[PDB]
Design a protein around this ligand. Structure first.
Ligand code: TZ5
Ligand code: TZ5
Ligand code: NAG
Lengths: 537, 534
């Protein structure tokens, strides 16, 4: 046939695809949703590296989002858009290694910069099919080819018996590398420039992006990287070999797979229903905690030849261009998932006791001395009992420790070692946010703006937000295009300068024009990055 | 003979001198002896009261300065010399001075007693900056200052011994205090309204009288300026004093030991200058704002450590005035911290800053020292010399003065005392120290004493009015326990310092500003965290 829209028929290397023509506000875009890039990682392939997708015959239908990787569904606030917007919107299946491509309609005559999105979700949840990752706007408005992939999360993606053949760990990264490889090979068929691939992701996806920066076999598959609210370095994005070994073994035991070599154990895990692994995942953490996740990248001496901090300290990043940044309230969201005293349904004014308790959960790896050091640092000694400040300090601790200071260390090390870094703080609370006021601009809530959702008039964003969304997409795609988020023509708008060790410049993203600022929580991050380590004894 | 200049005290008759103050005449009784000269066998010993004398004792001049180390850092430089002895040195130095109004006050006047500082190793009540003349004349106060023994002579202790029990300098002071109870009325002072006030070491001495029950009946109120009994430099342990006494004895040929009595006997046979010669050689570490012989925690004068005493004391009917100058640490830097001098802007390196902290917090472990550095670095301008220099100064001032002051203020206030706190931020126009030193340790005294009221000293009109303000606060404080002017009904009120609000006031040329929290975050570092690095 024959009768179909010729713009929707594309041949990639596994065979032919039929895409779908979608409405964006400013006009039509092409979508090729659910292109499979790996062999379904099921049965004997669980815990195993992805294998490239074997070619198919006929025209593969690529008009709808394919399955979401097997994962824990958040039931903290039943019916609450604030949590439900992050939950899976397609069937849960182990057969989920699919990707998506948005492109202009009609596809552009000459090659186009390619953004590749990697979702977040604590390496345990996430799905490229979620409303907030909808590439139609970037495609229609900026003329960009945008690609997002599903990668295996949780045990399926990250359970590791390091040194083993049957479960070597890091397979979720490997799924992402494979989507990356696929783009090199096929994106041209859609008018993307494979010589201009920019990786971007937020939170665990941001951490992912950083891992690709740090893994030799991924460096050839992209040219530019964007890390939103996450990093490879830090207390949560990786575990050591021993700790991953401990967690896998403990989970194995929990589902009735007693540990005594690795083959028997992994074989037994492979016989277990996927829902059983998910049901037991949370139980392997070493302490009561927040912003920690059971199955995450392992420092395997393979994908990661050393710890991320060792590699950012000694890596040569002679031109790499990265844009890094944070939201105003990185910590706030985490507090409702565990910390007593905190809730979305009230003001969360906590007591000093609740605060000391929170710091323990919030910095679980820290001794008595160190936890008391954090508390002394974040206490306002002028009002040391004030419920509002205590609440906000709890939020700042979780935020600073897990996101802001890792981001600061990242920028600093990169910049000091050849990279062109652009740094930002995103301060706009959405008008449409359902979370309470006290949470500020929570973790994840710049994404809807970077992706352009406010441009959809049916979504009820303000005109200001629509103009803002447009500004943001211009920064992002200018950066993709050029390595520089500035417009080479628009001299009147204030310029966004690179981040450097000498001046530590970064910009505010809010409804007002760009304001340049110096030092990203410089003083407090000296605490977390330089001092708190030295409380090693 | 002028009857106004003739007083009979318990030991006999005294002849004063009428002195010229700007606004009128004052009566001075200088060099009154309050103790048997603590010489020969009485060296290292508590003071005995002065024996009665015959006829009329000439009290028209300052008496000898207690034997001390004379500063030779910058010879003849005003900034340093103004602290050096301005009379002959002598172990025979237990003399006090009284300035009173001319004529003698008609009714009992509040009495204000000054105790100089000098790191318990130097000082003298005869120094130009402690001139009682102005407060006498202008505010009508009877002002009293004593010499007390310093250095080995005042504070060498072999604790538990009969012949060198330690703290005798403090006992000298206590005896001057007793003398005031017994005699001041004779000069028109009210023995029922005595305010102790002192700066630096003198401030810590005042603090020690607060914490020592036998001193408490000799005064009703206190003022601690840039100094505290608590904190890193004002006391030593019994074991630590023993060690330095012993080491000093070794350094001068004495006697090894063997026997306390024997060791002290030998020390007593040594010329004063021999003791001073080796005074500086007994410190455990390279350091600054540490002093060889200082009060000892004897379990007698000081029943426990000042820390223990302020934590658990009852200070219900006590009024205290405490404060600090803007740049407590700056002066100390020129005394041994490499890279610092008065003769240039002193723009140090990072290495110099890290080396300075070791010196500055001598007791500090490797980790504790790094905690300090990481706390005081401006992570935005990490290697800027101006920032490092100012930081080095801040470290020393905070560690030794401001946070100790902050801690004392809070304990007292929590435990019944009525506390008023200040930061003094005016740089005297006459200052011969360089700009980068700011308002150095000890340059508020000048103002409190009323020196800018003497037109010959070339202070500005502004400064004379500022000095007048200050004398009103202090003497209002002596008068009532409240530095506020109960006449002026037109703000801005100086509020009591409390744990809750932490209110204190800026003392500068502009009218009182009320600030809250005296380096609250930085002193949490120093007072709460840092102990926990044991
Ligand atoms: N009784 C049980 C049984 C099993 C599990 C349970 C509890 C909990 C838990 C729930 C409530 C309170 C305490 C613990 N967690 C807690 C995981 C921590 C969730 C923190 C929020 C977060 C952080 N990154 N991804 N997510 C998941 C939710 N998706 C979001 C995302 C983002 N931002 C936000 C912001 C607000 C709310 C949600 C949200 C941004 C990036 C992508 C996802 C789990 C974590 C596991 N790894 C496995 C099982 C369970
Ligand atoms: N070669 C030798 C031999 C013997 C001694 C020597 C050096 C030094 C020294 C000198 C220069 C550099 C390094 C060490 N100090 C250290 C002096 C420590 C005091 C530093 C400043 C200070 C603090 N409190 N009193 N003083 C003495 C100077 N008097 C002042 C005072 C005050 N303010 C100031 C302000 C600026 C300059 C001086 C000054 C206010 C209160 C009273 C005195 C001594 C200390 C001793 N305890 C014994 C002997 C010597
Ligand atoms: C998702 C959302 O906000 N939808 C609303 C809708 O319910 C309402 O009827 C309409 C008119 O105000 O505006 C839009």
């Amino acid at each position: 046939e024959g009768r179909e829209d010729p713009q929707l028929l594309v041949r990639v290397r596994g065979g032919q695809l039929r895409g779908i023509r979608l409405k964006a506000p400013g006009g039509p875009v092409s979508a090729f949703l659910g292109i499979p890039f790996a062999e379904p990682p099921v049965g004997s392939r669980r815990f195993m590296p992805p294998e490239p997708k074997r070619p198919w015959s006929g025209v593969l239908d690529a008009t709808t989002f394919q399955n979401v990787c097997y994962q824990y569904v958040d039931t903290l606030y039943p019916g609450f858009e604030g949590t439900e917007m992050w939950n899976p919107n397609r069937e849960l299946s182990e057969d989920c290694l699919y990707l998506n491509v948005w492109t202009p309609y009609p596809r552009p005559a000459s090659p186009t910069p390619v953004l590749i999105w990697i979702y977040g979700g604590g390496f345990y949840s996430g799905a490229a099919s979620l409303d907030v990752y909808d590439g139609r706007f970037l495609a229609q408005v900026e003329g960009a080819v945008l690609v997002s992939m599903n990668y295996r999360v949780g045990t399926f993606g990250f359970l590791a018996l390091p040194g083993s053949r049957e479960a070597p760990g890091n397979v979720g990264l490997l799924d992402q590398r494979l989507a990356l490889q696929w783009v090199q090979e096929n994106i041209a068929a859609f008018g993307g420039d494979p010589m201009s691939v920019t990786l971007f992701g937020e939170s665990a996806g941001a951490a992912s992006v950083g891992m690709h920066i740090l893994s030799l076999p991924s460096r050839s598959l992209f040219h530019r990287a964007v890390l939103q609210s996450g990093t490879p370095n830090g207390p949560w994005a990786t575990v050591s070999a021993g700790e991953a070994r401990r967690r896998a073994t403990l989970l194995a035991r929990l589902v009735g797979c007693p540990p005594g070599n690795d083959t028997e154990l992994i074989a037994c895990l492979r016989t277990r229903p996927a829902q059983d692994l998910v049901d037991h995942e949370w139980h392997v953490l070493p302490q009561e905690s927040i912003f920690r996740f059971s199955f995450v990248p392992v420092v395997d001496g393979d994908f990661l030849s050393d710890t991320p901090e060792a590699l950012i300290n000694t890596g040569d990043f002679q031109d790499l261009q990265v844009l890094v940044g944070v939201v105003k309230d990185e910590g706030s969201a985490f507090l409702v998932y565990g910390v007593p005293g905190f809730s979305k349904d009230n003001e969360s004014l906590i007591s000093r006791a609740q605060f000391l308790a929170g710091v323990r959960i919030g910095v679980p790896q820290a001794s008595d001395l160190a936890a008391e050091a954090v508390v002394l640092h974040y206490t306002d000694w002028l009002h040391p009992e004030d419920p509002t400040h205590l609440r906000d300090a709890m939020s700042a601790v979780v935020g600073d420790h897990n996101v802001v200071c890792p981001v600061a260390q990242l920028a600093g090390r990169l910049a000091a070692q050849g990279a062109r870094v652009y740094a930002y703080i995103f301060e706009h609370r959405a008008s449409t946010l359902t979370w309470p006021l006290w949470m500020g601009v929570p973790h994840g809530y710049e994404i809807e703006f970077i992706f352009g959702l406010p441009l959809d008039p049916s979504l009820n964003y303000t005109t200001e937000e629509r103009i803002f969304a447009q500004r943001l997409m211009k920064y992002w795609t200018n950066f993709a295009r050029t390595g520089d988020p500035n417009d080479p023509r628009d001299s009147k708008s204030p310029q966004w300068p690179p981040y450097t060790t000498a001046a530590q410049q970064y910009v505010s993203l809010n409804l007002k024009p760009l304001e340049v600022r110096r030092g990203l929580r410089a003083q407090t991050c000296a605490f977390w990055n330089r001092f708190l380590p030295k409380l090693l004894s």
